């Protein structure tokens, strides 16, 4: 585990005295110390922090995880950690991780994520705050995945998620983890409740009807709107997702059709709500056949 007990050779921990380092700091350093050799445990500065022009393969402690010192550190790619890490690590009696990027903490320490459906922006600054707070990231999905983020339904990993019934949440679920992690109200992501940050079934989804009983219209434009959809009255180009319609028949299906909007049937939407996520459309094509 801890580095006196670790099955890897001594390494140099050097803890930085920013004067910016917080109570958590000397608590990290009085825990550490029951694993580790004063000999191998340095204290440095920002002078001499800088003095440091390459990878010293050794591991830094720093909070925060900002200013001349830390940016300069990891810019080099250097092992780093919050003093959170420290604390959790002995505590709980197990080796540091590899910093192959910067680790403010482990609140997301058993998670591994993978995105899906998100802005370019969103989806790095999603990667950035999970592997701060301990978690895993992986590109593709896989069965180590514990949580898929997502920022609408429908795509294919999305689908795929949703057959492994693997939990799919938005990208909120992060950013509050990390907003109560810094607050200091969380300690463990299992602190939050998960459920409310739940993807709804048709987020991102605009849905039209017709050719349907008024009953049936209504009801879907209900559930449309209970299941986080947006339900418009009429069909227009550049804003509908989806035209639940039964027939290949009518100038509005003719419409949706060229315009590459989803022409499904209702069954496509009753089973989304069935299944508890968004369906594949293809399954469900209004016209069937390929012609």
Not at 3 to 14: C, G, L, T
Not at 104 to 117: E, G, H, K
């Amino acid at each position: 585990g801890p580095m006196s007990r670790n099955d890897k050779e001594p390494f140099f921990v050097k803890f930085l005295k920013s004067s910016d380092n917080s109570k958590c700091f000397f608590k990290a350093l009085e825990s550490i110390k029951e694993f580790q050799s004063e000999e191998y445990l340095q204290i440095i500065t920002e002078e001499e922090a800088l003095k440091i022009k390459e990878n010293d393969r050794s591991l830094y402690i720093c909070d925060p995880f900002s200013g001349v010192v830390f940016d300069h550190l990891k810019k080099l790619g250097c092992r780093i950690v919050g003093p959170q890490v420290v604390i959790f690590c002995m505590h709980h009696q197990r080796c540091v991780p590899r910093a192959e990027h910067p680790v403010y903490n482990m609140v997301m320490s058993d998670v591994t994520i993978s995105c899906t459906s998100l802005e370019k922006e969103k989806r790095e600054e999603v990667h950035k705050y999970v592997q701060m707070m301990g978690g895993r990231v992986y590109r593709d999905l896989n069965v180590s995945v514990t949580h898929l983020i997502a920022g609408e339904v429908g795509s294919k990993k999305y689908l795929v998620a949703a057959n492994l019934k693997k939990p799919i949440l938005l990208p909120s679920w992060i950013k509050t983890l990390w907003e109560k992690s810094q607050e200091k109200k969380i300690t463990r992501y299992t602190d939050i409740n998960m459920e409310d940050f739940k993807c709804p079934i048709f987020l991102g989804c605009i849905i039209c009807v017709t050719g349907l009983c008024g009953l049936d219209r209504k009801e879907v434009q209900q559930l449309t709107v209970k299941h986080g959809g947006q339900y418009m009255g009429q069909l227009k180009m550049n804003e509908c997702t989806h035209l639940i319609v039964q027939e290949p028949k009518g100038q509005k299906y003719e419409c949706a059709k060229r315009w590459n909007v989803h022409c499904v049937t209702t069954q496509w939407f009753f089973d989304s709500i069935e299944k508890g996520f968004c369906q594949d459309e293809s399954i469900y094509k209004t016209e069937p056949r390929p012609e």
